[PDB]
Design a protein around this nucleic acid. Sequence first.
DNA 1: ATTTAGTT
DNA 2: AACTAAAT
DNA 3: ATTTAGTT
DNA 4: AACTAAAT
Lengths: 255, 255
Amino acid sequence: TWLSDFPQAWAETGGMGLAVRQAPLIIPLKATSTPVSIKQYPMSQEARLGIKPHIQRLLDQGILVPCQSPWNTPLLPVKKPGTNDYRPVQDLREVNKRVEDIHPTVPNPYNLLSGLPPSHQWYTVLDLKDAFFCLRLHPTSQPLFAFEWRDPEMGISGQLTWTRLPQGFKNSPTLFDEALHRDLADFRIQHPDLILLQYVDDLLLAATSELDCQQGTRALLQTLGNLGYRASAKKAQICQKQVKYLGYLLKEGQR
Amino acid sequence: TWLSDFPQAWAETGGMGLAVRQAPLIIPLKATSTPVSIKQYPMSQEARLGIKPHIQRLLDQGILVPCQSPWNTPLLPVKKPGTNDYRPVQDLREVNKRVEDIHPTVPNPYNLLSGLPPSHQWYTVLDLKDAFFCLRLHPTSQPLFAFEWRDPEMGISGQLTWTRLPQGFKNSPTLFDEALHRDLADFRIQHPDLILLQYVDDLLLAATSELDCQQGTRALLQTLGNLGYRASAKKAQICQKQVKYLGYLLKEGQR
DNA sequence: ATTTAGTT
DNA sequence: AACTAAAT
DNA sequence: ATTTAGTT
DNA sequence: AACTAAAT
């Protein structure tokens, strides 16, 4: 039982993650940027009620904190179903435009998979849960991602912001990918025979023998857990001959 | 008085032209072409009355003749003014598509004018009237350009066609330009010092001295008249230092 | 609620 | 230029 | 009266 | 995709 031997490595039994080895991230602005404050678009009670539980959970988790900032972007009520449950989606486009660009270092899936040799037939796929939220944001950069939150009946001060790398920020995928690479560098050095592919929060470990894949997976889960990341036990594909990775179906070394 | 010394050369005093040296033109069809017969679109009495005098004049001139043909294209009532006088415009597009293409040998005005040296400052401009109609169409090709004509009160048999190169035919400008070049080849050889530019029916004669331009123009008018072409006395610009040719204003050797 | 790159 | 489709 | 290449 | 502009 992998879930039992590695309690800390799974999102199911390890609690929200936090990359303890990673220094809080500082987000540099473009040379001429000035704060932009876009008023919150009026939200219906339906959308607000649907979103509230999520905001509360994040505040309880310390991922969202009250603040007073010259920056402000609108929260969008987005429901996946035909018209069911709502979830908060922040429109950070005006913030993204004022943030200095960085080199896109995340490889496209096609090129990433090209590094998978035929020799390693035993695959293991893990996806990290709430990956961006595992990376802390430096207090100086936190104000940048502020939005307004007002509960008609006892609403928070006014604005809330993130203490972790947020969704909707143009550099999140790249910064997370680079941070995880730094954290798993040693693991790669300690396991020369293993093949590890990283695509932001989607990991593929490849070994030659079921045994290698087994021991390798134990080591990877142990490492991820200690670093503060959390993998989804529900979606985990362990030591399989066939697995689904990045939209592909890896079987017999195909795709 | 040029109009008096060259009666035959002017459209005003020489009658409709006819290039007597040019063999009637044979129009080759594309390898797979078959006759196309498009019914005449109903025409209002207003348009018909406006067009009638033109049709009658052409029939009197032998330019239009009755016929029975498997080919037929529509006549369009087109009035230049805001809604005044109508004139017949034949829609020969379906005929054009079935006629074999020929190399476009008429040079564009820009390139044509590049052959005008600074030495020849005395210009003479003539435009031939009803140029295409001066070229006969071989009896075998005449049926190709048939259209319907019916006078509510005593209408012609049915169809009429052209005995001369028609307007609206894709190869008319090129075939006329090549025919005139053949007819004026000798003139060019007999006047080495003169510069003659031809753009379909628009002619520009350039000389070094007013005298040369004078004698040259007399010779050109005499030649055109004898060949069966007719120039517009009204629009004629003779031995000028400045003239309008092909939309350009030739002055001092400029443009 | 807005933007934007595409399509029609 | 009026519509779609994506995207935050 | 229809077509067509362009624009909006 | 609804409109224009030319063209025969």
